[PDB]
Structure formats: C-alpha cells, structure tokens
Amino acid sequence: MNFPNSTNLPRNPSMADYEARIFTFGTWIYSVNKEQLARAGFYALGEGDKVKCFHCGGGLTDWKPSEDPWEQHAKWYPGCKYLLEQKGQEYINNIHLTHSLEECL
Ligand SMILES: COC[C@H]1C[NH2+][C@H](C)CN1CC(=O)N1CC(C)(C)c2ncc(Cc3ccccc3)cc21
Ligand code: NA
Numbered sequence: 001m002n003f004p005n006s007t008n009l010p011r012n013p014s015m016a017d018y019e020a021r022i023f024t025f026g027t028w029i030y031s032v033n034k035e036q037l038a039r040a041g042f043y044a045l046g047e048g049d050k051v052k053c054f055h056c057g058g059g060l061t062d063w064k065p066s067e068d069p070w071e072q073h074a075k076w077y078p079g080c081k082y083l084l085e086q087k088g089q090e091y092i093n094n095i096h097l098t099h100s101l102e103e104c105l
C-alpha cells in the first residue's frame with residue numbers, strides 16, 4: 001500500500017543490522033526460519049508471520065514451508081537494491097523466469 005523503495009538507501013536504517021532484525025522475532029513459531037528471514041533483510045512486525053524488508057519496506061505474510069525468503073523477496077519486491085547487492089541480477093532473473101514459468105504449468 002506504500003510504494004516500494006527502489007533507491008540505494010534503506011527505508012528503515014534502524015533495521016540495517018542483522019542482529020537488530022533478529023531481535024524483532026522473539027520466540028518464533030512459524031514455518032520459516034527467522035535467521036533465514038533476517039539474512040534476506042526481513043524483520044518481524046509482531047503480527048503473525050508479517051515481515052518487512054529494512055531496505056525496500058516490502059511486506060510479506062503467510063509463510064508456507066515451501067516458500068523461500070530470498071525467492072519471495074525477489075518475486076514481490078524485484079526493485080529492492082538490497083536484494084540486488086546480496087543476490088545479483090543473474091539470480092534475480094532465474095527466480096523471475098521460474099515464477100513466470102510456474103504459472104504456464
Ligand atoms: C498473496 O499472498 C501470498 C503470500 C504467501 N506467503 C509468501 C511468503 C508471501 N506472499 C505474498 C504476500 O505476502 N503479499 C503479496 C502482496 C505484495 C500483494 C502483499 N501485500 C500485503 C501483505 C500483507 C502485509 C502488510 C504489511 C506488512 C506485511 C504484510 C502481503 C502481501
Ligand atoms: Na514475537
């Protein structure tokens with residue numbers, strides 16, 4: 001509902017450190033690994049399994065065990081500069097192609 005941040009500056013610099021992000025989860029009952037989420041730039045909002053990226057501000061919920069933090073970050077927030085720094089455009093391309101071909105079948 002807010003536009004995604006596509007600049008090279010994080011929207012939430014307080015959540016720029018891995019450990020700051022990790023503290024937001026507390027006891028975490030959900031399908032997806034909190035360290036894997038924090039590594040993908042996500043921090044917990046404290047409302048179910050709602051997460052936001054510190055950089056793009058992008059929000060995600062309802063984590064299925066088959067859903068990967070980085071893959072989901074690329075699917076929904078392809079313009080995130082943090083995603084690009086960490087993963088590269090080659091990875092990001094694969095993910096898009098895979099998702100866009102998942103639809104076909
Ligand atoms: C359609 O859903 C599918 C799920 C399934 N599980 C994975 C991990 C992710 N998928 C996308 C997702 O969660 N999306 C997509 C979209 C961009 C349309 C969106 N908009 C709002 C919310 C709710 C929210 C608000 C504020 C902060 C965090 C979340 C969630 C959401
Ligand atoms: Na919590």
Ligand SMILES: [Zn+2]
Nearest residue numbers: 053055056080
């Ligand atoms: Zn992001």
